[PDB]
Copies of this chain bind each other. A is one copy, B any other.
Amino acid sequence: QPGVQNFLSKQWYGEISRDTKNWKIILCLFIIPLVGCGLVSFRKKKLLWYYVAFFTSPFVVFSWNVVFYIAFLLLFAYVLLMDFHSVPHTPELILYALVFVLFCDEVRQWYMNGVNYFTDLWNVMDTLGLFYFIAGIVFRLHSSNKSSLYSGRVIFCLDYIIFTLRLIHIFTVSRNLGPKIIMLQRMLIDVFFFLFLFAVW
């Protein structure tokens, strides 16, 4: 109902006024100074408080996390394709640190919930990705051998596929792509029938 949606939108934008356009707030996110300016309108209510409100909003936190995840994917790809060696270099250690941060957050989410946590597909995929990353690390530290390194690299590539596919899940709140992403679940039986006939033939 519209009332609950408006309440959720107000919570989502936090202090920032919902009347503000998204591109303005994104631009102010990318360049800090403009938040001190009047480009972004704060409905609820000194620059210090302005910045605190701007950076306490879950909307901005989500956007920042998306940027961080994209940068993490870029670093992962660069390490995998261009700077993979017998002994890990600095970028790979940074990647390990970022994955450790993701793992600690995942453990927090584990503890908050119970075994119902693993009843969702995406949580299972996250756990699988972390486990495969750990397995790749284990394989890759046998630098003397020339086959364990490549096994770890393949593990990392599959894990990269799994990591990349999470973007679809995280972009289900866009209000333009979300409904269409949701609608894909309803179309699986047609695919099953198609594959059945195709396989028989």
Contact = CB atoms under 8 A, between A and B. Distances in A.
7 contacts: A164-B200, A165-B200, A168-B197, A171-B196, A176-B193, A177-B192, A180-B190
A192 B168 contact: no
A189 B176 contact: yes
Interface in A152-201: 164-165, 167-168, 171, 176-177, 180-181, 189-190, 192-193, 196-197, 200
Contacts of A164: 200
Contacts of A197: 168
Interface of A: 164-165, 167-168, 171, 176-177, 180-181, 189-190, 192-193, 196-197, 200
Tell me the number of copies of this protein.
Answer: 3
Contact of A193 (B177, B190, B193, B196): B177
Given A164-B200, A177-B192, 13 more contacts: A165-B200, A167-B200, A168-B197, A168-B200, A171-B196, A176-B189, A176-B192, A176-B193, A177-B193, A177-B196, A180-B190, A180-B193, A181-B193
Sorted nearest first, the 8 A-B pairs with minimum C-beta distance are A180-B193, A177-B193, A176-B189, A167-B200, A177-B196, A164-B200, A168-B200, A176-B192
Nearest to A194: B180
Contacts of A177: 192-193, 196
Contacts of A167: 200
Nearest to A167: B200
Contacts of A165: 200
A187 to B, nearest CB: 13
Contacts of A171: 196
Nearest to A190: B180
Contacts of A196: 171, 177
Contacts of A192: 176-177
Name, among A164, A165, A197, the residue most crowded by chain B CB atoms within 10 Å (CB to CB): A197
Nearest to A178: B193
